[PDB]
Amino acid sequence: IVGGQECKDGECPWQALLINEENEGFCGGTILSEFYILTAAHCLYQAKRFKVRVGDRNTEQEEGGEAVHEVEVVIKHNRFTKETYDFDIAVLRLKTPITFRMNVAPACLPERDWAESTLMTQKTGIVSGFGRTHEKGRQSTRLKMLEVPYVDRNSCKLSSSFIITQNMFCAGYDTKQEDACQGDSGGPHVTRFKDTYFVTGIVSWGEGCARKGKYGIYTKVTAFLKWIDRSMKT
């Protein structure tokens, strides 16, 4: 995350971190339930074997709430395509259930029509992660969050060198130095409505981080609500 603020105690409890064999985070995820994590399909190619860490805000100290979970099943969307990142979504079933507590809780899945008309028409959403704090930097050792405006769909397509499919949406800033960045991929984009936070996107891609005239591109979770539901029933 470029810009934004640190997630304070209890503020981003649905954040998950995909960690490689070396205990290093490479992607984020969103806690959907005691057994399931939502992430980006492209993240699945960035490590041979990985686990999921929850309840962590500082990778340099033991806060007492952290928990590592092994993955039992990876459910990657079959229409995912590496050439465009269309259908950039996967669900992970964990071997053991997450025990909710301070800093560990799920985000809500909304209904499609209401989310599109009411949540995605709000001024902003919130993206979070342990990704780089600058395009050329190191990963953050602190979990960060950032309020990101939803961006007009026509404006986004005009701004992009790569296709924006029906499965994607744009969020962020034209020139302000604030955006998600490398290492945030697969992480949560949530929208607050009356103090309840609903999952609205998955950090997917961007032409660099916080570039002028470029926005963050997110998987449109509302296009995948039935698919998520199915993946979580088996």
Add this chain to the structure above:
Amino acid sequence: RKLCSLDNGDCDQFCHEEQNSVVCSCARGYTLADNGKACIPTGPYPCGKQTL
């Protein structure tokens, strides 16, 4: 601005229009209150709430 377009039809969460009236509902892990509008967590750590 009518029904669900008017302040979310007074619903805490999901709002649907049926036979020209508002019907509220809630995310999994919440129960619709007696007023048919508010959503009440069914147990601890309900989805979408910051922890303290």
